[PDB]
Amino acid sequence: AQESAEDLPTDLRIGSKMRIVSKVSFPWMNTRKSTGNVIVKFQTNDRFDGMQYFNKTFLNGYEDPTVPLPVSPMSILEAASLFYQFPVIPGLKMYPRITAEQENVSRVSLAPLVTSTMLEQWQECYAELYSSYKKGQRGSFYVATAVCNVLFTKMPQKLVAVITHTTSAIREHLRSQGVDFEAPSPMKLANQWLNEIGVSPRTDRAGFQCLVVHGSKIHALFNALMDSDVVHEKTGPYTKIPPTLIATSPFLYGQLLSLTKSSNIFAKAGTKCTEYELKLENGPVLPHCAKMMTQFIRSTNMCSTEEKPVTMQVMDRHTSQGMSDWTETATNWNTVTIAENCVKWTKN
Amino acid sequence: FEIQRVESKFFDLDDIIAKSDSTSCTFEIGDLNPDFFQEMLGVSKPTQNADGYGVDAPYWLLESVRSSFSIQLPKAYSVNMQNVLNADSKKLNLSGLQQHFYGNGMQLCRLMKGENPDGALSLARCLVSTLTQRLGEIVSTATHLQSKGEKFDSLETKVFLEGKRCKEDIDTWLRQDN
Amino acid sequence: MNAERCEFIAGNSLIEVIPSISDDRPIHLISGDIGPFEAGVPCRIPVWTAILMKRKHNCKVVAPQWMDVDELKKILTSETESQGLAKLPDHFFEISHMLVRDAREDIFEVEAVKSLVQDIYDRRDAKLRSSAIEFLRQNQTCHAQLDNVQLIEASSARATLEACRQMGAVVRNKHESTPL
Amino acid sequence: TGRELIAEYRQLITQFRNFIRDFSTGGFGMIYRDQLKRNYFSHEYRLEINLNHLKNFDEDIEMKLRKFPGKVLPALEEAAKIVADEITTPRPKGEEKLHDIQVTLTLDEYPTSLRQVKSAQVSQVVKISGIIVAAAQVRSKATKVTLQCRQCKHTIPDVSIKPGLEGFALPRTCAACPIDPYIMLPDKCECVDYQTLKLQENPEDVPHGEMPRHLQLFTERYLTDKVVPGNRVTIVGVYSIKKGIRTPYLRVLGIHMETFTTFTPEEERMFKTLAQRKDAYELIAKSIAPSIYGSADIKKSIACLLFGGARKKLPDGITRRGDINVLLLGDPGTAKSQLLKFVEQVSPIGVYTSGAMVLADGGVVCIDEFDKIHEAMEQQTISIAKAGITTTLNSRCSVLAAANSMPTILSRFDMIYIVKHDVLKDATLAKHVIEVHVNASAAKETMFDTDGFLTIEFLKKFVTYARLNCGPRLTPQASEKLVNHYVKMRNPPITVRQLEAIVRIAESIAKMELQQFATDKHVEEALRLFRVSTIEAAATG
Amino acid sequence: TTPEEVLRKMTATWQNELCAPCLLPTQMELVEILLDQIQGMEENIGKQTDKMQLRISVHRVELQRIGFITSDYVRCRLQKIESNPHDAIDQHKKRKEEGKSDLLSESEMKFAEEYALAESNLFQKTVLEFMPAALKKMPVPRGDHDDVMVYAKVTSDDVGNVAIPDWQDLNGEVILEMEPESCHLIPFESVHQLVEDGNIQLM
Ligand SMILES: [Zn+2]
């Protein structure tokens, strides 16, 4: 069945890729109607203006929904595609980090000085982010370890932490570390009976799961993520490389980065249906990205024949399953239809 | 004179034999009429435990069960065997395990999608890796005159037969020119 | 499509002969005029017609220019140096086998020509084998480029098509098994 | 003068490369080039060469190869390696290593008598014929070795050892340290397989009133495990003296041999046609031993012995036998041994004899002169406990026995016959048999045979087919008759052994028709056979 | 247009028809022209008084070759129609609705209808008359040429771009460029339209 609203519902699961398909051409494409590949070409101050709009949206440490828009809609497209990340290595992919989801990225040999100084910086960077989250005023942030994804956030205060894609072994290791969570005999009589006669006594899985932590108990999880060799890989392509941290507001050692963009034109069978494709790749697709991309489409009036809709798709969200279950303000969705009058999705 | 459109492999004898196989499964107690085990399977009384009725059922019948049921993977597709085959399958006798290996695996994935999505995806990844480890050996093995294709699956047999046919044709054309 | 039909298509090529008979009018074939014939004066006719006359002792066949030993050595040098398949004359192997079968009296330096053709065939066969084996380890694409492949070489290598069709089904099953 | 030998060696390699590349039967047929390519892609690193083809190509190198094989033959092997590299490059990834190839020879000549190898032929190629009489286990021989000094640890790598039954001497003193200081590393040497055989001269060629002579053979790599004792062979090899008197041996370069369970759809259709016929059982009984007159019920019993019953194992683990056993009594004549020899020929596995009881798992044993084991017949096992040994030997078989006459062992046999005034009928039989023997003298001067009887080659295959595929059971209506027959005979020597024997015979008759079940028809024929056989012993003696 | 051009077009049509996994648009016009040419040459040779001379043998061998080409083309198309006759009729009607060139000629269509009736009679007499009333409909399988590969060579200068499925992400597609001498291993449905237009030769 179909579900619908005036505006895009929020989903908090981070994905790996976004694809958007339309029957109406994008502004840089308008010369062409033959099948082929097209560069997303930017013009004059559009990138810089989009960067301004992004930082102005997130300056307080949480989103301001009342900032005025830029003038070029290309700046809205640019502002949707930005984030802050640590650690930094050129030429190594830093997301996704769960070992099952890596394609075989190439080896990179590094010096012990490089790896040691990186770890020394990582501890300070992580402690700064966690301090500003708990006792300061920062909104939220993500961590992607080799075995799980973690989200720290606030309830609309009360603090909440969510862990996803755990095994029973990881659950028991966290129990040994002392974390608590709001998770989702006749054999003794037999041994006693054997001993009473004088016969010799020598004669949980539950798949993948998520976890939720409330309140003061979050600090134990913070110390656990600081300490364990379980999350610090000692063998493999990510040997001695610490976990990835991601945010939408600046932090010390954070590097500003952008997703890769490209686009294509397809034509078929002599029909009216030429199809125009946009892609955003090679990083996390954070929840604000879809919200801003909706505004890019509606500002550029591609909905004007609402009888020809535009569709959007976000991929690999199942690796972070559970991050939208803890509240009524969020939703799980995978494919979305945009019109000017509404936004629609399946019952899922 | 009225026409009904059906599957593209409706008349295939190999596909009918593949549908005719059976797997081990379990049904909830009292949620189904116990006439079923005599009516369909010919078994007078179901074997019963704390988890449910435990039986074997065929794939054609299992697709029709819109009620609740559960599946246990057979011996050839158990997780230890999945690790073994994913580690090295380049010289193993798959026909000794199952003559319809890849087909029964694809049927198991389609059934297990509603119960266990992670297990279904894991088995699908294992199948892709297993075929990638063996296709080059099949296409190379077809070129020998003494090969007879003892170890291959029914799916792999098609590739083997086509390769041997091509080799026979080009050798016959070459040996005119003495 | 098979090797006999490859030889049948290769028979339509043109080749030069020297007749010993003579004739006055042209011959108006459906494939076009070929005559007239004068004894001792060369002219160009189809390969099938040339072999038909050679069996009846009515002519002498003149070999193609690429059957010179120096030209064959140039072809072997280029095929050895290039990573992919080098370019060849049209219907190279088929015309070589037909002329060695029916007209080996008129070829000059026959054993050297024969050995060079066998060398070229051997290493092109090895290149095609290595390319197909390296393709069948792939999972990321269903496309390859095979420039300068001959028709008989393409005809001998049809197992790869069946193998790729079988691989696509399992890839599609994994994509449909991915959860949402 | 080593550069002269190097020049000779490289010249030989050049000529052998030209021979492997250029020899042809006309057209595009370069046979050795094509054979080498096919062997290399079949992962067989070997080649075989005909010396008369080599003599036609170039006489001089062939003559040199015969007279100096230890010098010349490594050049031929090296040339084969070079040509294989040229043919197969560029090889796929993972297959970059170039392998080492063994060359073998054939030669079309009369073989030399094993007694007439002249002493001038030492270290030359010869051709010999004979019989293999013994074969040892495969062992390993080192091809290249690494040496290290005991004290100062200096090394000599890749020291190569000459082939055959030859040793080699280590360096006496250090090259860079007492007497004999070098040792051999077990981990850094190369090895190949070898085998030793013994050859006996053919008994046709032994002069009258003398014993045959023998020669020892050495084989290597692909020439190992090619022969078994009893084989007749012709061998090409080098005549060598083993390391002022030495013993000789032959280093083999080429061997030439002088000599079920799978069916076609045609064979299955033939078997099923015979099974579909109504007279199939009578036809098989007629087909048993057609050269011997009469004996119709005995031939039917032998057919039941060949086919046997089903074999069973109940959930408590107690097994039930499928075999059937038959005994023949009476006068010592009337072609009893010929019947036993026929059963030995026809049976899928079997033995004839006058231990021997063990050797026929799943087969048939024919015992003649039985008046010369109770555990063997019933338990399919014999046991022993004498001084210092206790074992049990277990084997499954059926037994056919012929006697010339214990009352105890008669319980172990399922069917018994007494063979027993012929002279008027024997006149016609004498006419027929003597006409057969005069026709045999004149001779001295594929389902069916010419006379309509089944052929041995079809019958043996059909028995081997039926045993692995039929496996019948009784119908309830067939079971109902035997209870009444048993009670009536016992309350008008009746035992459960006899009842189970009758059940086995009924299953055996139903097996020949390829039935799912036995019925009242098969039970009645089984009862007739049991009465006709067994009541002779009740009436006689 | 000369017969020398008609025969050259017919040979390329024959090669593409042998290689393709399904049914190309019909070319019975060229077949009819070449059959008429065979008959004309036969009657012209029949008017000759002397036949033991070289010209007559050369002409007769050429007629042998042309007869082989036309017969093999018609045999291949009939063997394709016999596999699934109802689907062939359906595809022809869909091409007529789309306003495209013909899939079947008139005689081919008549053969397809008569073969479909003759095939229906056997199933109706053996099985379907004994079924319950719901199960009396005739089954017709769907098409089967979804994952077929071909070796294809480019001959035209300005072919442009082609789209193929993406095995890394089967939601989307990949775009290829076809330079005008290249040979590719490629799915058939990507090159179907160009094979109809004659810009690609199958191998
Ligand atoms: Zn020393």
D278 Cβ contact partners less than 8 Å away, ≥ 6 residues apart: none
DSSP letter for each residue of chain B: --EEEE-TTTT-HHHHHHHT-EEEEEE-TTSS-TTHHHHTS--SS-EE-SS-EEEEEEHHHHTT--S--EE---GGGSHHHHHHHHH--TT--HHHH-TTHHHHHHHHHHHHTTT-HHHHHHHHHHHHHHHHTTHHHHHHHTT-SS----S--HHHHHHHHHHHHHHHHHHHHHTT--
CB contact under 8 A, A36 and E169: no
CA–CA dist B103, B105 (Å, integer): 5
User: Considering only CA atoms, which of B105, B101, B96 is closest in space to residue B123?
Assistant: B105
Q: What is residue A99's DSSP assignment?
A: G
Nearest CA in chain C to E182: C147
- Token readout for D71 is 């010098």
CA–CA dist D343, D302 (Å, integer): 8
Nearest CA in chain C to B137: C133
Nearest CA in chain B to D42: B144
Write the residue in D25, D38, D41 that is nearest to B178 by C-beta.
D25
* Nearest-CA distance C82 → chain A (Å): 29
Site of tokens 């399977």: B41
D58 Cβ contact partners less than 8 Å away, ≥ 6 residues apart: D15, D19
Backbone angles phi, psi at C35, to 5 degrees: -85, -165
Write the residue in A19, A34, A37 that is nearest to E171 by C-beta.
A19
CA–CA dist C18, C50 (Å, integer): 10
CA–CA dist D440, D434 (Å, integer): 9
Contact status of D91 with chain B (Cβ, < 8 Å): no
CA–CA dist E15, E73 (Å, integer): 9
User: Considering only CA atoms, which of A29, A8, A83, A15 is closest in space to residue A249?
Assistant: A83
Question: Quick check: D62 and C103 in contact, CB under 8 A?
Answer: no
Q: Contacts of residue B146 in chain D, CB cutoff 8 Å?
A: 42
CA–CA dist B127, B23 (Å, integer): 18
D177 Cβ contact partners less than 8 Å away, ≥ 6 residues apart: D149, D150, D151, D152
State how far the alpha carbon of D194 is from the alpha carbons of D136, D139, D223, in Å. Answer: 10, 5, 8
Write the residue in E171, E172, E175 that is nearest to A35 by C-beta.
E175
Question: Quick check: B154 and B136 in contact, CB under 8 A?
Answer: no
CB contact under 8 A, B5 and E138: no
B150 Cβ contact partners less than 8 Å away, ≥ 6 residues apart: B93, B95
Question: Quick check: D76 and D16 in contact, CB under 8 A?
Answer: yes
Contact status of D26 with chain B (Cβ, < 8 Å): yes
Site of tokens 């009036």: A301
Burial class (CB in 10 A: 0-12, 13-18, 19+), C28: middle
Question: Quick check: A165 and A320 in contact, CB under 8 A?
Answer: yes
Site of tokens 């393409």: C154
3-state helix, strand and coil shares in percent for chain E, rounded to the nearest 5 = 55, 15, 30
Q: What's the start-to-end Cα distance of chain B, in Å? A: 60
Question: Quick check: D233 and D209 in contact, CB under 8 A?
Answer: no
- Token readout for D156 is 């000599």
Q: Contacts of residue B116 in chain A, CB cutoff 8 Å?
A: 207
Measure CA A83 to chain center. Answer: 11
Write the residue in B144, B146, B178 that is nearest to D26 by C-beta.
B178
Three-state DSSP at A162 gives strand
Chains touching chain B through at least 3 C-beta pairs below 8 angstroms are A, C, D, E
Contact status of A56 with chain C (Cβ, < 8 Å): no
How many contiguous H segments (helices) and E segments (strands) does chain D have?
15, 21
How many contiguous H segments (helices) and E segments (strands) does chain E have?
6, 6
Q: Contacts of residue B174 in chain D, CB cutoff 8 Å?
A: 28
Q: What's the start-to-end Cα distance of chain A, in Å? A: 8
Q: What's the start-to-end Cα distance of chain E, in Å? A: 27
State how far the alpha carbon of E79 is from the alpha carbons of D261, E11, E74, in Å. Answer: 40, 19, 9
Q: Identify from D17, D35, D87, D95 which residue to disrupt to test chain C contact, counting C C-beta atoms within 10 A and taking the largest count.
A: D87
- Token readout for B170 is 């080009």
Paired residues of D328 in beta bridges: D402, D417
User: What residue type is assigned to position A263 of the chain?
Assistant: S
Q: Residue D43: count other Cβ atoms within 10 Å of its Cβ.
A: 8
User: Considering only CA atoms, which of C57, D491, C1 is closest in space to residue E16?
Assistant: C1
D161 Cβ contact partners less than 8 Å away, ≥ 6 residues apart: D141, D142, D143, D144, D145, D168
CA–CA dist D404, D328 (Å, integer): 8
User: Considering only CA atoms, which of A41, A54, A49, A62 is closest in space to residue A81?
Assistant: A54
Residue A138: half-sphere exposure toward Cβ, Cα within 13 Å: 18
Question: Quick check: D475 and D519 in contact, CB under 8 A?
Answer: yes
Distance D173 CA to ligand 1 centre (A): 7
How many contiguous H segments (helices) and E segments (strands) does chain A have?
7, 15
CA–CA dist C146, C136 (Å, integer): 15
User: Considering only CA atoms, which of D343, D342, D373 is closest in space to residue D356?
Assistant: D373
Report the side by side order of strands in the sheet with A2-5: A2-5, A343-346, A335-338, A310-315, A17-22, A275-281, A260-266, A36-38
State how far the alpha carbon of B107 is from the alpha carbons of B59, B62, B154, in Å. Answer: 8, 10, 15
Site of tokens 């081919």: E108
Contact status of B129 with chain A (Cβ, < 8 Å): no
Number of Cβ pairs closer than 8 Å across A and C? 4
CB contact under 8 A, E58 and C1: no
Chains touching chain A through at least 3 C-beta pairs below 8 angstroms are B, C, E
Question: Quick check: D414 and D309 in contact, CB under 8 A?
Answer: no
Q: Is the dihedral of CA D317, D323, D324, D328 positive or negative?
A: negative
Distance D192 CA to ligand 1 centre (A): 30
Q: What is residue D112's DSSP assignment?
A: B
CA–CA dist A338, A292 (Å, integer): 13
Burial class (CB in 10 A: 0-12, 13-18, 19+), D5: exposed
Q: Residue A153: count other Cβ atoms within 10 Å of its Cβ.
A: 18
CB contact under 8 A, B159 and C156: no
State how far the alpha carbon of D26 is from the alpha carbons of A229, C64, C118, D148, E79, in Å. Answer: 74, 22, 14, 55, 41
* Nearest-CA distance C3 → chain D (Å): 17
CA–CA dist E177, E163 (Å, integer): 9
Contact status of B177 with chain D (Cβ, < 8 Å): yes
| Pairing, β A310-315 against β A36-38 | unpaired
Q: Contacts of residue B9 in chain E, CB cutoff 8 Å?
A: 141, 144
CB contact under 8 A, E140 and B6: yes
Distance D152 CA to ligand 1 centre (A): 4
Three-state DSSP at A263 gives strand
Nearest CA in chain A to E99: A270
Longest dimension (CA), chain E: 73
CA–CA dist A24, D386 (Å, integer): 100
Three-state DSSP at A109 gives coil
Burial class (CB in 10 A: 0-12, 13-18, 19+), A198: exposed
Contact status of C177 with chain E (Cβ, < 8 Å): no
- C-beta contacts of A66-71 below 8 A and 24+ residues apart: A69/A295, A69/A299
Write the residue in E160, E169, E171 that is nearest to A34 by C-beta.
E160
Nearest CA in chain B to C179: B117
H/E stretch holding A313 reads: strand A310-315
- Token readout for A252 is 């010390």
- Token readout for D444 is 């001295």
Backbone angles phi, psi at E186, to 5 degrees: -150, 150
CA–CA dist D274, E59 (Å, integer): 59
CA–CA dist B92, B152 (Å, integer): 9
Q: Residue D286: count other Cβ atoms within 10 Å of its Cβ.
A: 17
Is D320 known to sit in a ligand binding site? yes
- C-beta contacts of D428-436 below 8 A and 24+ residues apart: D429/D293, D432/D293, D433/D293, D436/D291
CB contact under 8 A, C165 and E147: yes
Nearest CA in chain A to C139: A103
Site of tokens 């036995």: D518
User: Considering only CA atoms, which of C30, A231, D471, C113 is closest in space to residue E65?
Assistant: C30
- Token readout for E192 is 């179907």
Q: Contacts of residue A208 in chain B, CB cutoff 8 Å?
A: 118
Write the residue in C115, C126, C134 that is nearest to D21 by C-beta.
C115
Q: Residue D96: count other Cβ atoms within 10 Å of its Cβ.
A: 9
CA–CA dist D296, E185 (Å, integer): 73
Paired residues of D319 in beta bridges: D313
Buried b (16+ CB within 10 A) or exposed e, C147-167: ebbbbbbbbbbbbbbbbbbbb
Number of Cβ pairs closer than 8 Å across A and E? 21
Q: Contacts of residue B177 in chain D, CB cutoff 8 Å?
A: 27-29
- Token readout for C70 is 């120096």
CB contact under 8 A, D92 and C129: yes
CA–CA dist E36, A78 (Å, integer): 69
Q: Residue C17: count other Cβ atoms within 10 Å of its Cβ.
A: 23
Burial class (CB in 10 A: 0-12, 13-18, 19+), A299: middle
CA–CA dist B64, C120 (Å, integer): 60
* Nearest-CA distance C134 → chain A (Å): 18
Angle value at C-alpha C126, between C124 and C132, nearest 5 degrees: 105
What 3 state SS string does E27-84 have?
CHHHHHHHHHHHHHHHHHHHCCCCCCCHHHHHHHHHHHHHHHHHHHHHHHHHHHHCCC
Contact status of C60 with chain D (Cβ, < 8 Å): no
| Pairing, β C43-46 against β B53-58 | unpaired
CA–CA dist D81, D102 (Å, integer): 9
* Nearest-CA distance B141 → chain D (Å): 9
CB contact under 8 A, C123 and D89: yes
* Nearest-CA distance C60 → chain A (Å): 55
Torsion of CA E89, E90, E96, E99, to 10 degrees: -140
CA–CA dist C106, C115 (Å, integer): 17
Contact status of D24 with chain B (Cβ, < 8 Å): no
Question: Quick check: D230 and D131 in contact, CB under 8 A?
Answer: yes
Question: Quick check: A19 and A279 in contact, CB under 8 A?
Answer: yes
The conformational region for residue C108 under phi > 0 = left, psi -120 to 50 = alpha, else beta, is: beta
B43 Cβ contact partners less than 8 Å away, ≥ 6 residues apart: B37, B55
Measure CA D150 to chain center. Answer: 51
Residues ending a continuous segment of chain B before a break (C–N > 2.5 Å): none
Backbone angles phi, psi at B123, to 5 degrees: -65, -35
DSSP letter for each residue of D38-50: HHHHTT--EEEEE
CA–CA dist E148, E165 (Å, integer): 13
Question: Quick check: D304 and D508 in contact, CB under 8 A?
Answer: yes
